[PDB]
Amino acid sequence: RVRDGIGILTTAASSMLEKFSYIPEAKASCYGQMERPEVPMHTLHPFMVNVTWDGKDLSFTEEGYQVHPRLVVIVLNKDREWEKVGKWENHTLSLRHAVWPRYKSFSDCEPDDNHLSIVTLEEAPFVIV
Amino acid sequence: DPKIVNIGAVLSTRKHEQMFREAVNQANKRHGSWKIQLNATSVTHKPNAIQMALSVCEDL
Amino acid sequence: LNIAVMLGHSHDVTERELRTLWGPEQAAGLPLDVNVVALLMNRTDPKSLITHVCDLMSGARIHGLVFGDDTDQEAVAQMLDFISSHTFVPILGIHGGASMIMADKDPTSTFFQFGASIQQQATVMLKIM
Numbered sequence: 059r060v061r062d063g064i065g066i067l068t069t070a071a072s073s074m075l076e077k078f079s080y081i082p083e084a085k086a087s088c089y090g091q092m093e094r095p096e097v098p099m100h101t102l103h104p105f106m107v108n109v110t111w112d113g114k115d116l117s118f119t120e121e122g123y124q125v126h127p128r129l130v131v132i133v134l135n136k137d138r139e140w141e142k143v144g145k146w147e148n149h150t151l152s153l154r155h156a157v158w159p160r161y162k163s164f165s166d167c168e169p170d171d172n173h174l175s176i177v178t179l180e181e182a183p184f185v186i187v
Numbered sequence: 188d189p190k191i192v193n194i195g196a197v198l199s200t201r202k203h204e205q206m207f208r209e210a211v212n213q214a215n216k217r218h219g220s221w222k223i224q225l226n227a228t229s230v231t232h233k234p235n236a237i238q239m240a241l242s243v244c245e246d247l
Numbered sequence: 248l249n250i251a252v253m254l255g256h257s258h259d260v261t262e263r264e265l266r267t268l269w270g271p272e273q274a275a276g277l278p279l280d281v282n283v284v285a286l287l288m289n290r291t292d293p294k295s296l297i298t299h300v301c302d303l304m305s306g307a308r309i310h311g312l313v314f315g316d317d318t319d320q321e322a323v324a325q326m327l328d329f330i331s332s333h334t335f336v337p338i339l340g341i342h343g344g345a346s347m348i349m350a351d352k353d354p355t356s357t358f359f360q361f362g363a364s365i366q367q368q369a370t371v372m373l374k375i376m
Contacts, residue, residue: 093236
């Protein structure tokens with residue numbers, strides 16, 4: 059993450075310099091006297107969106123957060139630990155379970171006695187896939 | 188009396204300062220003086236934005 | 248183009264040069280002055296945070312700062328915006344407390360988190376449903 063962020067800042071600075079050769083000067087002193095608006099234009103705020111870095115497509119929105127977050131849905135295991143199942147890369151859930159495993163809700167709970175794993179065979183008039 | 192609360196404030200002009208003090212005194216002239224004794228301190232404004240946060244932290 | 252990074256002091260509290268040695272042979276091209284002035288963090292308080300940032304700002308013409316706090320004080324994020332409110336130095340946080348989203352920021356400042364908005368989480372929830 060640190061390396062990615064430094065790369066983002068460097069790329070934004072390079073793009074700003076390429077747009078025109080006017081480097082932005084830092085502020086005089088926060089602890090000093092009062093401040094007044096003196097920026098001829100937004101130095102690097104517009105130079106923040108639409109930036110790529112070796113495949114990573116972080117594209118912070120106008121609201122101010124990433125448009126492609128690395129979100130992973132997690133589920134509690136049977137040993138009171140957080141597991142990990144399924145990422146979210148472009149838009150797909152890419153889930154990691156074709157069928158949801160019926161998990162023991164508690165050590166003191168009624169047994170699962172209402173689920174039947176029925177089976178069938180593909181015929182013409184009985185089942186059609 | 189041993190309990191002493193410390194309500195602060197941040198007003199605009201120095202004169203209102205005095206007003207504030209007198210106000211809190213009324214809040215003790217009517218309500219009691221055993222488990223109370225509200226004590227009033229304040230500060231006045233600054234123009235350096237971050238100086239506001241620094242002053243409020245350090246003083247109040 | 249001198250920037251600074253504040254670490255978490257908890258997980259990788261060692262080898263400041265290791266962070267300083269990012270992309271040794273070639274990080275991203277190093278256009279003009281790509282150098283790290285990263286410092287170390289500790290127990291964070293608004294007085295201490297403001298003091299450290301203001302002191303560093305009156306230093307080697309600091310630029311965009313990457314924040315990596317480890318603790319979760321929640322309100323810290325807001326405080327960060329406040330600094331970017333009154334000193335036109337862009338700033339972004341990646342890990343920890345400055346990770347939870349804050350929503351509507353002041354349109355006259357730049358500060359971009361790296362977390363997940365409410366809407367994205369709700370969308371992923373409905374997709375998993």
